Amino acid sequence: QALLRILKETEFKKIKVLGSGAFGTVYKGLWIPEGEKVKIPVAIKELREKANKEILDEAYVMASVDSVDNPHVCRLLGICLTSTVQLITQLMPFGCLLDYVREHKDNIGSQYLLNWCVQIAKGMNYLEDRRLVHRDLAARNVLVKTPQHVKITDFGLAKLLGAEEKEYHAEGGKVPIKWMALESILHRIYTHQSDVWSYGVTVWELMTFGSKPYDGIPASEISSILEKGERLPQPPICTIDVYMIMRKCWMIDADSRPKFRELIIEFSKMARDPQRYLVIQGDERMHLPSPTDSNFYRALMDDEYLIPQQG
Numbered sequence: 001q002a003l004l005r006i007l008k009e010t011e012f013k014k015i016k017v018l019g020s021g022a023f024g025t026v027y028k029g030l031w032i033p034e035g036e037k038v039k040i041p042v043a044i045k046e047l048r049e050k051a052n053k054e055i056l057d058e059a060y061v062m063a064s065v066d067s068v069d070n071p072h073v074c075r076l077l078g079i080c081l082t083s084t085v086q087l088i089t090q091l092m093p094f095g096c097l098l099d100y101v102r103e104h105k106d107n108i109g110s111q112y113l114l115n116w117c118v119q120i121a122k123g124m125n126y127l128e129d130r131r132l133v134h135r136d137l138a139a140r141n142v143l144v145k146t147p148q149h150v151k152i153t154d155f156g157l158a159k160l161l162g163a164e165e166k167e168y169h170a171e172g173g174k175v176p177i178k179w180m181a182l183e184s185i186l187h188r189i190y191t192h193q194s195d196v197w198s199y200g201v202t203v204w205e206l207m208t209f210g211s212k213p214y215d216g217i218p219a220s221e222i223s224s225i226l227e228k229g230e231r232l233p234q235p236p237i238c239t240i241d242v243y244m245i246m247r248k249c250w251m252i253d254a255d256s257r258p259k260f261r262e263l264i265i266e267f268s269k270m271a272r273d274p275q276r277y278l279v280i281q282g283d284e285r286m287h288l289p290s291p292t293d294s295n296f297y298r299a300l301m302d303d304e305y306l307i308p309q310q311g
């Protein structure tokens, strides 16, 4: 039962732009629901300007998959009807994971990387259980609540499969070619197993501390590269077992790829002996802010999408 809570514009103060890009504009603000005095840090999203129709579809997906215990997927708090339709969620104060890994490379140890991989797989497994194909899993669409806790976001491309359906077949909208499974590029078919491909690319992004995949290669060439058996390279920090997970995610046969339930288990195993699996210089000397740190409050200070050319 998908409900959308309407929040009045006047319950929001101190709205400030956080960032803009392909996702539209995201603002941060303070939500003070009338009836209470509690002040809740929020993020507020509106699309680029159709915009109204599209963003309600995202609200619907998010409301559809919401649940009492939902750690690793962003929850919709409500929507706001102003000059635009805006979505409202809890602020993730450390920002986008892609920016985070680029900015904090020198303090990101093996334990953090492996834990993030586990968390993203747990979030995706949750979505799979609710018949949701995300279709845009990428490091740009993972957010950082704390350095120890990430969440999947951006349901702009996401689709719910009916009880009889195994796949979603797309029409001609712009799609993230460099993160897509070959079958999605060739045939516009999307499944939970094409999300696994995207998961593999996401892991690659993290393990390279936010390198751009297939940098300098036009998206029009990607299907040909994949058909020749070429893949993203082994990141220097990754031991062979970690890279082999990525390579399994990029198998041609979708049903031969790992399932998210398997990825949780495999990455959890690695997270139990992190320095065995990732080799990072100075790993033991690295630290990131954690809620259990006495000074954690100090940290809380005040063309990837292309028109398809096949299928």
Ligand SMILES: COc1c(Cl)cccc1Nc1c(-c2ccncc2OC[C@@H]2CCCO2)[nH]c2c1C(=O)NCC2
Binding pocket: 018, 019, 020, 023, 026, 042, 043, 044, 045, 074, 075, 076, 077, 087, 088, 089, 090, 091, 092, 093, 095, 096, 140, 141, 143, 153, 154, 155
């Ligand atoms: C879709 O869930 C949201 C809702 Cl319901 C409302 C506002 C923001 C989001 N998510 C996003 C944030 C966001 C959510 C919560 N806290 C901070 C945030 O932005 C942090 C930085 C700022 C710009 C890049 O991310 N940032 C991004 C999304 C998104 O959908 N796509 C990519 C960039």
